[PDB]
Structure 1
Amino acid sequence: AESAANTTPSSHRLETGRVPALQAAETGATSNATDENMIETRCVVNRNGVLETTINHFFSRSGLVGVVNLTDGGTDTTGYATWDIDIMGFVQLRRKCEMFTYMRFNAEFTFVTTTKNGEARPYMLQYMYVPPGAPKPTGRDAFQWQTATNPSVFVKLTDPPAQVSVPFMSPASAYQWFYDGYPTFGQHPETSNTTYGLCPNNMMGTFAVRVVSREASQLKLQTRVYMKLKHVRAWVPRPIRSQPYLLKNFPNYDSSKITNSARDRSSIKQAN
């Protein structure tokens, strides 16, 4: 259907037996009472489109995902800057994605790198994706930066932002943002269940970045990750969270200081 719905011409009824406005809500179903079984309507040929409300047009937005700092000092230097790939770091795309239970999609990661004061000097960077199980690079001159049997992107700061496409690589058939279980067997404590809700089917490796040079470069870069979902399929729709987020991998909320879903009114017998 390319349009929403057309309206049939209706009229009045004067007869017993037909009750379309007495739909019982105790059955768990939604009231199917239309306008034609009610106040007299007319013939309207609606041609309003429904294409924008689809899932592929709703999840085709990039949004901010990760912010990675790279100081590259001279005396307190590290060289590299890894970033665990997770979507729960910023509450916008998290709120947009946690309204479903199971999802399956592809990615269009984009990397925007700027300096501290803001300046595009021609410094070439190396963006490395470390899959889960591969060793992480330790140092700006490590052995792992050879990128043999490992995908990496070489780009400068004066160049346009890099953009790669990422397939679906979870060992399960779909992702999940809510895991009602435990990752392994054993006795689970009563004090602090810090492993509850953890899903090993979402650890998508680690993302590292360094500056390709010989000695050093006294510059503090700041990379931003923009992930565009595509080819997305969602299952089991879940309600939208009404409480402020507190942690990344845990949906914890405030016991006291609760936020009501609707703001307060003057009286119940007042519309304004």
Structure 2
Amino acid sequence: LETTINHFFSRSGLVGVVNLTDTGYATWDIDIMGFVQLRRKCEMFTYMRFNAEFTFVTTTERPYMLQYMYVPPGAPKPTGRDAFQWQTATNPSVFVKLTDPPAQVSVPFMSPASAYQWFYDGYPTTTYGLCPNNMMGTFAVRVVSREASQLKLQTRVYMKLKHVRAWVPRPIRSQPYLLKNFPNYDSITNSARDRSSIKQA
């Protein structure tokens, strides 16, 4: 079939759009809650478990040795393009030329708990419902040269979900939401559009 839960997530859609000037670098936190087409399909469930793979597509406006680092959760993020975090061998990085076909890399499942939680009701001890066990890291795109890059490049990050397993369901969201990581709704819209009367279908 194609109504199984693995096929329902198996399209590789856009997540984040990252551009860099030459500052000199550009970082990007990993989060799937960026667009409304993926949030409404992932607040469906409460507990999920999945491996992900990525793809970086680069549109200038020739090839350079730009790299894509990876930060596992806990490692410090780079502050400058010539800092000492770019050469730490514990951060797995991917060197890819521009003119080559686009990069592709997989990420395993890093949360300490058995599955990711999209709803936490408690505290870590404004700190309400912020479970720290959803951190997946950054990427920190950097063009590599000795000085004076001067590209004005823009990357795009795609994401495919694989081997996904879902637990206990929840009903869908029915209202637009203001904040990024909170269900606040600013009380009201309805669900079904009106008709004239109760009669006359």
* Larger strand fraction of residues: 2
For 2:64 and 2:194, how far apart are their aligned partners in 1? 54
**Which runs of at least 4 in structure 1 moved beyond 3 Å after TM superposition?**
none
| 1:62-113: CA deviation from partner (whole Å, max 9, x where unpaired) | 111112221xxxx99x222111111111111111111000000000111112
For 1:244 and 1:234, how far apart are their aligned partners in 2? 24
For 1:159 and 1:246, how far apart are their aligned partners in 2? 40
Query: Who wins on radius of gyration, i.e. which is larger?
Result: 1
For 1:82 and 1:170, how far apart are their aligned partners in 2? 21
Deviation at 1:165, TM superposition (A): 1.2
Contact 1:99 1:238 in 2 (8 A): yes
**Greater relative contact order: 1 or 2 (C-alpha under 8 angstroms, separation 6 or more)?**
2
Worse overlay, 141-150 or 229-238: 141-150
For 1:107 and 1:100, how far apart are their aligned partners in 2? 18
Q: Give the match for residue 168 of structure 1.
A: 109
Worse overlay, 238-247 or 168-177: 238-247
Aligned residues: percent identity? 100
Deviation at 1:219, TM superposition (A): 2.4
| 1:135-183: CA deviation from partner (whole Å, max 9, x where unpaired) | 2222122211114122111112221121111111110000011111112
Deviation at 1:247, TM superposition (A): 2.0
Q: Give the match for residue 264 of structure 1.
A: 194
In the superposition, relative to structure 1, how do residues 251 and 113 fare at CA in structure 2: closer, same or farther (>3 Å)? Answer: farther
The alignment yields a C-alpha RMSD, in angstroms, of: 1.7
Worse overlay, 211-220 or 230-239: 211-220
TM-score (norm 2): 0.93
Q: Give the match for residue 106 of structure 1.
A: 51
TM-score (norm 1): 0.70
Unaligned ranges ≥5, structure 1: 1-50, 116-120, 185-193
Contact 1:102 1:174 in 2 (8 A): yes
| 1:15-60: CA deviation from partner (whole Å, max 9, x where unpaired) | xxxxxxxxxxxxxxxxxxxxxxxxxxxxxxxxxxxx1000011110
In the superposition, relative to structure 1, how do residues 52 and 198 fare at CA in structure 2: closer, same or farther (>3 Å)? Answer: same
For 1:178 and 1:220, how far apart are their aligned partners in 2? 39
The number of residue pairs the alignment matches comes to 200
